[PDB]
Amino acid sequence: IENGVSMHKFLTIPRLEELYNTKQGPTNPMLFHLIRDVKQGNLPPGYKITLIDIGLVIEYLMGGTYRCTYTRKRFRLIYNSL
């Protein structure tokens, strides 16, 4: 960042979607569990995580009427574009 990296340019969907789907680093076994809960109990074997699914975790973790930007119409629309 100091030597000239703009995180606005480096934060596309596939990248930030890739960042969740990494075993090349310190990972959380808690996250894949949280995803199984919000997904009605199912987990397909491959299952590259998506951002609409992270949204359901945060909405579950923040509780109440919290609604993440990953579950909105604007994002769900452009998500299917990319």
Would you tell me which residues interact with a copy of itself (CB under 8 A)?
A: 1-2, 4-9, 29-30, 33-34, 37, 58, 60-69
Q: Which residue type does 78 have?
A: I
Residue with smaller CB distance to a copy of itself, 7 or 82:
7
Q: Are 54 and 32 in contact (CB under 8 A)?
A: no
Token pair, residue 22, equals 């990494």
CB of 35 to a copy of itself, least distance (A): 12
CB of 32 to a copy of itself, least distance (A): 10
| Rounded-to-integer distance, Cα 34 and Cα 72, Å | 20
Residue with smaller CB distance to a copy of itself, 22 or 66:
66
Residue with smaller CB distance to a copy of itself, 18 or 37:
37
Q: Are 34 and 61 in contact (CB under 8 A)?
A: yes
